[PDB]
Amino acid sequence: WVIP
Amino acid sequence: WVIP
Amino acid sequence: SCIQFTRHASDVLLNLNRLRSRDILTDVVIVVSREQFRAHKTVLMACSGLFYSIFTDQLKCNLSVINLDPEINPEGFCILLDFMYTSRLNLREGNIMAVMATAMYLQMEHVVDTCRKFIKAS
Amino acid sequence: SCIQFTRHASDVLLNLNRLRSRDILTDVVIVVSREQFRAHKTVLMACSGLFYSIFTDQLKCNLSVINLDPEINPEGFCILLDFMYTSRLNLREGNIMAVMATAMYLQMEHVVDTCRKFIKAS
Ligand SMILES: O=C1Cc2cc(Nc3cc(Cl)ncc3Cl)ccc2N1
Ligand SMILES: O=C1Cc2cc(Nc3cc(Cl)ncc3Cl)ccc2N1
Ligand SMILES: [Cl-]
Ligand SMILES: [Cl-]
Secondary structure (H helix, E strand, C coil): CECC | CECC | CCEECCCHHHHHHHHHHHHHHCCCCCCEEEEECCEEEEECHHHHHHHCHHHHHHHCCCCHHHCCEEECCCCCCHHHHHHHHHHHHHCEECCCCCCHHHHHHHHHHHCCHHHHHHHHHHHHHC | CCEECCCHHHHHHHHHHHHHHCCCCCCEEEEECCEEEEECHHHHHHHCHHHHHHHCCCCHHHCCEEECCCCCCHHHHHHHHHHHHHCEECCCCCCHHHHHHHHHHHCCHHHHHHHHHHHHHC
C-alpha cells in the first residue's frame, strides 16, 4: 500500500 | 514497454 | 520471450471503472440494506473471494440480484466497490471498522490486512 | 486522501485471465476465419477501440457472436487476445506484420506503436  |  | 506494457492492467481497470460509472454492460445489482449497487460480475469475482464463490455456483451465476447479509453497512460496501474498480481505498478513522468488517465478509484479504495494520497503529 | 494497493490492477487482470482460461462468465465468441475465441465483452472493450464501439452499440451489445473481417489472421488475433488479458505481447519477426495489422483493425494504439518501433529498428 502507498500514498498515490 | 519492458522485458518482464 | 514476450514484451510487457507496464500501464496495461491499470488502463484496463480505469476503462472498466468508466463502464461502471456509465452503467455499461453491468450485469448484477448488489443490494445492501435499502441501497443498490450496479456492477460487473467478473470484476466482483476478480476482487472478492465471496463473489468468486457466488458467481461460480451453477445456480447463483445466473442471478441478476444478490442480497448481502443485513449486518453489512452500505457505506463500507461502497468504499470497497470503489477500491475494486480503482485500487484506491478511502480508509478513514470513522469508516475503518465498517470497511474491515465488510472486507472480511467479502473475503478481500489485502484490504483486511491494511485495516488490521491501521487499527494496530492507533 | 485514499491509500493505494500497487498490485491490485495486475491481480484483477490475472484473475480475469484465469476466468477466461476456465471459460467462466465468457459472454461472446469472436470468429476469425475458421477459428473461435471466447472472451468477456468488458475486457475486449477495455482493450480495444473496435470492441468498445461494437459493444456500446444498442443492437450489437446483445450479440453473442462477432465475426471479424476475413483479412484478419487468427494467430494475430490470438496473440492480441492474450495481451489483453496479461499485458504480455508475443511479438516475433514471423508474426509482427500480422500483429500490427490486427492491432490497427482492433484499435489498440499502444500495440500499434511498439510494432512500428520494432519494424523501424530492423
Ligand atoms: O482476497 C481475495 C481476492 C480474491 C479473488 C478471487 N477470485 C479469483 C481467484 C481465482 Cl484463483 N481465479 C479467478 C478468480 Cl476471479 C478469489 C478469492 C479471493 N480472495
Ligand atoms: O487503443 C485503444 C484502447 C481503447 C479502449 C477503449 N475502451 C474504453 C474507453 C473509454 Cl474512454 N471508456 C471505456 C472503455 Cl471500455 C476505447 C478506445 C481504445 N483505443
Ligand atoms: Cl483485496
Ligand atoms: Cl494497446
